[PDB]
Write a protein that binds this ligand. Structure first.
Ligand SMILES: Nc1nc2c(ncn2[C@H]2C[C@H](O)[C@@H](COP(=O)(O)NP(=O)(O)OP(=O)(O)O)O2)c(=O)[nH]1
Ligand SMILES: [Mg+2]
Ligand SMILES: [Mg+2]
Length: 425
DNA sequence: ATTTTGACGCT
C-alpha cells in the first residue's frame, strides 16, 4: 500500500550509439554512409570477424560475430571497414577517441557512468527538477519529443503510431504535480532529446536512448526502438512489457543465471517472477540475486548511476588460435613486447589526459587446449610506463608455465596485459 | 579459427 516504495525516485537514462564503430568509419569515409556496411577485425581468416553492422546490412541478416565472407554470402554489396592494425594486432584507438567525444558531450548535461565504449547511463533526477522549476507549470508539447516512443502506447505507419502513443501519453499527463513520476520521466525524455541532438550536432553520430527510473529499465528501453529513437518506459508499463519479455533480455540475465532462473522456476518471461516470494528467490539464487530479482520483476532496481566517465582498467589482448599459437620463447617475448608497447602508449596518454597512474600490471594467458578463456592471471607491480620493463615483468611472472626442458609448451593461445589500480597523479 | 576488451561478483 502506502509504504510499498515503488522505485520511482530517480530518472535514469541509458544512451547507446547506433552501430557505433560503423558510424565512426562512415563519418571518416562518406562513401560508406547509408549503405550496408560492417566493421571487421583482420582480413586473412574468412575476410575477418564482424564486430559492428549498419542497419542497412542488418536487413540482410548480417550480424556481429559473423565472418565477413559468410556475411558477403548474405549481402554481396556489403561494404567493410577494417580495424586499424599496429604492432601486428588490432588497435581500437579511433573508437576510444570517438567514444571520448560522445562521453564529454553527455557530461555537460549530467553526471554519467561510462558503461561501455559506446554507452553511458545518466542520472537526470536533479536536471529534471531544475527543468520542471523552469517550466513553471507549462505543459509539455509533442514538438519537444520528436523521436520519443512511449512503450505500451497507443492502446485502445510507424511515425503515425509513435505520434499516436505520444499524444495519448501527453494528454494523460498531470503537469501540475511536480512530483508525479510520469511527469518526471517525460521531462527526462525532453532532456534526452536535447542530449541526442547535441551528440549528433557535435559528432555526426546518431544514438538511441532509454528513459526510465533505473539502469536496467533504461537499458532495456533503449533497445526497443533502435536506431535513432529513444524510448520512455514508465513504471506503469512494466507489467505488460514484462508479461512477454524473455528473461534473457534483461541485463545480467542473458547467461547462466538467466538459464537457471528459467529451468529451476519453470518460467519463460520476466513477469512470472512476481509470483515467488523474496525468500524463495533468495533460496534458489542467493540473497543478493534473490533480492535483486524480486524487485526487478516489479520494475524496481536501486543500483546507482556511478559517477565514472573513464575506464577503470586499460588492457591489451591478442588471441593466437590453433596453428598460430606461440610455441617458442622468442615469440612470447616479441608479442609481450608488442602488447606492452601499445599499453605504454595508451597509459602515457591516459596519465597526461586524466591525471592518474596505474599501479598494478595484470598478465593473463591461455594455453592451447585449455577449456577456459583465461588459463592464468597473475599480477605484479607497475612502477614505470616502460614497455620493455612491463613485458619483462609479464614474462618473469608467467615463465613458470613453460614445461619444456628455448621452446614453449603448451603453446599460448592468448596473451593479455591489463593496467589496473589507478591512483591520482 | 568470431576477437578485443572491460565491469563486476565470489571466495
Ligand atoms: N573488439 C570488439 N569490439 C566489440 C565487440 N562487440 C562490440 N564491440 C564494439 C563494436 C560496437 O559498435 C561497439 C558498441 O557495441 P554495441 O552497442 O553492443 N553495438 P553497436 O553500437 O555496433 O550497434 P547497436 O548498439 O546500434 O545495436 O563495441 C567485440 O566482441 N569485440
Ligand atoms: Mg551501440
Ligand atoms: Mg552498446
Amino acid at each position: 500500500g502506502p509504504h510499498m516504495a515503488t522505485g520511482q525516485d530517480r530518472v535514469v537514462a541509458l544512451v547507446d550509439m547506433d552501430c557505433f564503430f560503423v558510424q565512426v568509419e562512415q563519418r571518416q569515409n562518406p562513401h560508406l554512409r547509408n549503405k550496408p556496411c560492417a566493421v571487421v577485425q583482420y582480413k586473412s581468416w574468412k575476410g575477418g570477424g564482424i564486430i559492428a553492422v549498419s542497419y542497412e546490412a542488418r536487413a540482410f541478416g548480417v550480424t556481429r560475430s559473423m565472418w565477413a565472407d559468410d556475411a558477403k554470402k548474405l549481402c554481396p554489396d556489403l561494404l567493410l571497414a577494417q580495424v586499424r592494425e599496429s604492432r601486428g594486432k588490432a588497435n581500437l584507438t579511433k573508437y576510444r577517441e570517438a567514444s571520448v567525444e560522445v562521453m564529454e558531450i553527455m557530461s555537460r548535461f549530467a553526471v554519467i557512468e561510462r558503461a561501455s565504449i559506446d554507452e553511458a547511463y545518466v542520472d537526470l533526477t536533479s536536471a529534471v527538477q531544475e527543468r520542471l522549476q523552469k517550466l513553471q507549470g507549462q505543459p509539455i508539447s509533442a514538438d519537444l519529443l520528436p523521436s520519443t516512443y512511449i512503450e505500451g502506447l497507443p492502446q485502445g505507419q510507424k511515425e503515425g503510431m509513435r505520434k499516436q502513443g505520444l499524444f495519448q501519453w501527453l494528454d494523460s499527463l498531470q503537469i501540475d504535480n511536480l512530483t508525479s513520476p510520469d511527469l518526471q520521466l517525460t521531462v527526462g525524455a525532453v532532456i534526452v532529446e536535447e542530449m541526442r541532438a547535441a551528440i549528433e550536432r557535435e559528432t555526426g553520430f546518431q544514438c538511441s536512448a532509454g528513459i526510465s527510473h533505473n539502469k536496467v529499465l533504461a537499458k532495456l528501453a533503449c533497445g526497443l526502438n533502435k536506431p535513432n529513437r529513444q524510448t520512455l518506459v514508465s513504471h506503469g508499463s512494466v507489467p505488460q512489457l514484462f508479461s512477454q519479455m524473455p528473461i534473457r533480455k534483461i541485463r545480467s540475465l542473458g547467461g547462466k543465471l538467466g538459464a537457471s532462473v528459467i529451468e529451476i522456476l519453470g518460467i519463460e518471461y520476466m513477469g512470472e517472477l512476481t509470483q515467488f516470494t523474496e525468500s524463495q528467490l533468495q533460496s534458489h539464487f542467493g540473497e543478493k540475486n534473490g533480492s535483486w530479482l524480486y524487485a526487478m520483476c516489479r520494475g524496481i532496481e536501486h543500483d546507482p548511476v556511478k559517477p565514472r566517465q573513464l575506464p577503470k582498467t586499460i588492457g591489451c589482448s591478442k588471441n593466437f588460435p590453433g596453428k598460430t599459437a606461440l610455441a617458442t620463447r622468442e615469440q612470447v617475448q616479441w608479442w609481450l613486447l608488442q602488447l606492452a608497447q601499445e599499453l605504454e602508449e595508451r597509459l602515457t596518454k591516459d596519465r597526461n589526459d586524466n591525471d592518474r597512474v596505474a599501479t598494478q600490471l595484470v598478465v593473463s594467458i591461455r594455453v592451447q587446449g585449455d577449456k577456459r578463456l583465461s588459463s592464468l592471471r597473475r599480477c605484479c607491480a607497475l612502477t614505470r610506463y616502460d614497455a620493455h620493463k612491463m613485458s619483462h615483468d609479464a614474462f618473469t611472472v608467467i615463465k613458470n608455465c613453460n614445461t619444456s626442458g628455448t621452446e614453449w609448451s603448451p603453446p599460448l593461445t592468448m596473451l593479455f596485459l591489463c593496467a589496473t589500480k589507478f591512483s591520482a597523479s
